[PDB]
Write a protein that binds this ligand. Structure first.
Ligand SMILES: OC[C@H]1O[C@H](O[C@H]2[C@H](O)[C@@H](O)[C@@H](O[C@H]3[C@H](O)[C@@H](O)[C@@H](O[C@H]4[C@H](O)[C@@H](O)[C@@H](O)O[C@@H]4CO)O[C@@H]3CO)O[C@@H]2CO)[C@H](O)[C@@H](O)[C@@H]1O
Ligand code: ZN
Ligand code: ZN
Length: 525
């Protein structure tokens, strides 16, 4: 479905000040007459790339900067072009986190970092090292309480300990990041995760402790310490708990390295209100009047606005937030970060629950992260290899030839997908492309429809149906499909896929693997 013009729909995570932002949306409504609707769906960071690719989705997407690069690579975000004076209104390093391929793709909002939150009534002077926490918990068990309870279901909360001794996501030496080099199955990461598992072995922590269980246990004085961010400061105030925000403990003397997140706001590429959403994000809801209103509901930490960050720089809770931030490192915004987080989430959960040893869980995370971040397009492959496209030597999957430079560019032009077999990567040459389309169309042809009849047969609008050229396999754009409708021409259903003629073209066991390889070549979308 298409987005309604004249209305702003904003998606933001549930643990943020969405009520504090909805009140700012009404201030923009009093001056412009445009209602600003906020929504906090579950798994919005995953549902957004599902619906933004079909033109649907909200107008503004709120998340930490690590996810936006994947949205920009998929062509889901609109380029942010602020004024030269507006870029100096915010800190320069916050803009570096929202730049992808030399282009601003989001608005920096606030810098987030984990910190050690403890109950001062139940723990004076928290420990400076993780190693003395088992001894500290044994004393509090006699008092009927526990020492530390934080979220163990999201790797964001456990990564400070894992990265303290050598664990890293993607290694960056001199230029960019190294996708093939992931630092999850190293000696330092195995040490950090082992200490976390032994904490669960000795009944000092519970593997099923999530976000709300660790929050309720700290908002009721049941546990002494809890690791969380600035957004969870308001729930502790309403619970009347004398707490403190201090530095995270160290492991092997080395300080914990939390992954620093810059909350950002991106504009949907299919939004009919790009200028309306830009006016809200820039002038009439980002200044000190807007950031202060959102901070009332859920605190944001060290904001990116200079005129407002100095008014809270002397905050003891925010001062420690920046101390853990400098001892950590900023999250990459590369599209491969989703593969990293998915692999580490499984590793921590499987290790904590005892389903895998720490060694096996981290070894599999290394393999899974690389296997999920592997290039799908020729351009991505050349960038992965840090070589120009014409230096790529890509075997064809369907014959013994290697692709020419033109065939390499045509591979991505026709929206093909790289094939991975036995470690080798494969493409498809021009002759095999046309040869596969002919065999597919002359052996698996199912039905014919005339123009707009495809919408009923496919149960989808013409814009949302994936149609490829029955001759050259290229993906048809919206105008090619509408032209077939206007000219009353034929759409064909072949191998449960829809085919047509692009504006440019005119006219047993070995075959099953052939047609199976063609499925992976064309993909689902
Ligand atoms: O089991 C599948 C799970 O998938 C969903 O969560 C995923 C996300 O899709 C990924 O984006 C990633 O999440 C990262 C996140 O990208 C990163 O910003 C950071 O998130 C912080 C955030 O910065 C901070 O502002 C605050 O909101 O806390 C967040 C962490 O709780 O770290 C995340 C990694 O933990 O990886 C997770 C999966 O690990 C989906 O939301 C899950 O429900 C689902 O189970
Ligand atoms: Zn070939
Ligand atoms: Zn064609």
């Amino acid at each position: 479905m298409k987005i309604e013009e004249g209305k702003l729909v904003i998606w933001i995570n549930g643990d943020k000040g969405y009520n504090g932002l909805a009140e700012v949306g009404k201030k923009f409504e009093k001056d412009t007459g445009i209602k600003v609707t906020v929504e906090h769906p579950d798994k919005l960071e995953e549902k957004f790339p599902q619906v933004a690719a079909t033109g649907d989705g909200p107008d503004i997407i709120f998340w930490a900067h690590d996810r936006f690069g994947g949205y920009a690579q998929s062509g889901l975000l609109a380029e942010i072009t602020p004024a030269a004076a507006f870029q100096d209104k915010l800190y320069p390093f916050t803009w570096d986190a929202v730049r992808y391929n030399g282009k601003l793709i989001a608005y920096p909002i606030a810098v987030e970092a984990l910190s050690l939150i403890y109950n001062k009534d139940l723990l004076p002077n928290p420990p400076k090292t993780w190693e003395e926490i088992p001894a500290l918990d044994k004393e509090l068990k006699a008092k009927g309480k526990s020492a530390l309870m934080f979220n163990l279901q999201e790797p964001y909360f456990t990564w400070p300990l894992i990265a303290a001794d050598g664990g890293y996501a993607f290694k960056y030496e001199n230029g960019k990041y190294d996708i093939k080099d992931v630092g999850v199955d190293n000696a330092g990461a195995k040490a950090g995760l082992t200490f976390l598992v032994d904490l669960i072995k000795n009944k000092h922590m519970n593997a099923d402790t999530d976000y709300s269980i660790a929050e309720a246990a700290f908002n009721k004085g049941e546990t002494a310490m809890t690791i969380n961010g600035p957004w969870a400061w308001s729930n502790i105030d309403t619970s009347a708990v004398n707490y403190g925000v201090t530095v995270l403990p160290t492991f092997k003397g080395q300080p914990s390295k939390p992954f620093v997140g810059v909350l950002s706001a991106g504009i949907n590429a299919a939004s009919p209100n790009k200028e309306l959403a830009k006016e809200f994000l820039e002038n009439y809801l980002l200044t000190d009047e807007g950031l202060e209103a959102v901070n009332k509901d859920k605190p944001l930490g060290a904001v990116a606005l200079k005129s407002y960050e100095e008014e809270l720089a002397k905050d003891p809770r925010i001062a420690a937030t920046m101390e853990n931030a400098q001892k950590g490192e900023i999250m990459p915004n590369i599209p491969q970060m989703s593969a990293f987080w998915y692999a580490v989430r499984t590793a921590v959960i499987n290790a904590a629950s005892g389903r895998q040893t720490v060694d096996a869980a981290l070894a599999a995370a290394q393999t899974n992260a690389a296997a999920m971040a592997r290039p799908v397009k020729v351009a991505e492959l050349a960038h992965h290899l840090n070589i120009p496209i014409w230096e790529v030597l890509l075997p064809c999957n369907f014959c013994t030839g290697f692709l020419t430079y033109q065939e390499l560019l045509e591979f991505d032009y026709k929206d093909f997908n790289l094939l991975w077999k036995d470690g080798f990567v494969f493409g498809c040459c021009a002759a095999c492309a046309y040869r596969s389309a002919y065999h597919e169309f002359t052996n698996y042809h199912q039905e014919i429809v005339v123009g707009i009849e495809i919408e009923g047969r496919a149960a989808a609008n013409i814009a949302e149906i994936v149609v490829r050229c029955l001759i050259c396999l290229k993906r048809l754009d919206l105008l090619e499909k509408l032209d077939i409708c206007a000219q009353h021409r034929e759409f064909h259903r072949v191998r449960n896929r829809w085919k047509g003629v692009c504006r440019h073209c005119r006219v047993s066991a070995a075959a099953e693997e052939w047609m199976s390889d063609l499925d992976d070549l064309l993909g689902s979308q």
